[PDB]
Amino acid sequence: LAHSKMVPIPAGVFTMGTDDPQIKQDGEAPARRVTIDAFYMDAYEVSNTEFEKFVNSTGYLTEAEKFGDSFVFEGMLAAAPWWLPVKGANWRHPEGPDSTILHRPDHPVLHVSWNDAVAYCTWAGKRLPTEAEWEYSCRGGLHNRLFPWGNKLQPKGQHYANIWQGEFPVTNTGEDGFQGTAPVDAFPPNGYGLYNIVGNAWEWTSDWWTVHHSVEETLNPKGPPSGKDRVKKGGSYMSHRSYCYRYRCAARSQNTPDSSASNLGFRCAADRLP
């Protein structure tokens, strides 16, 4: 296991966003050409084991632990009736106090806030990716495709990401092999060597959230200088076409930086190898 390995994301220009937005309120549009300098991206979401190394090293208490609760999806026992603030739910106890991570060390760490993620990545000699870096990486060298691998959800009849199958939120069939999270090295890599960049856990990025984007060409954009929510990308194991169609690289959502949930994790990036 090398679940902290990074891959070189090549220098390039890509179309960020889309002129065919699927969720218009999220500012998926307009499409804009963005230039990204070569950098490194974690091949995997940060796993429980990797996060545990950080916590072992630093003694870090995550915000969910300090707050004493975090959001858990009702189906595994608010923004929606299916989100419950559960006392004692945190990265070590992802569905509450009588859940454990002992059997899922290689699954993505959850209930980590933006601050928690920044703490981890910086500890690791890394940083959060910007939204543009994240999306560029997600797209895996393809232009204007829905998903890291293309435009078909199940290419060649194969599941390519851990999302929801069935009727959300009542029934997750686990057709793709995972009802909750999957190991961080599950599913095929995209063209750049990234695993679970869409689906599995949502992923924090460094950007403040805005829905107002210029069509101006940009270089290594960092997002707006101010905001109240940070950008998260990629969807999760709860995502479905019918209500949270955000397992697309262009998709985007947000949360306040102190937010945590049972479907939200992260991966790091770095300008050079740490």
Partner: peptide, 5 residues
């Protein structure tokens, strides 16, 4: 898709 705290 995720509630804010």
């Amino acid at each position: 898709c995720t509630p804010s705290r």
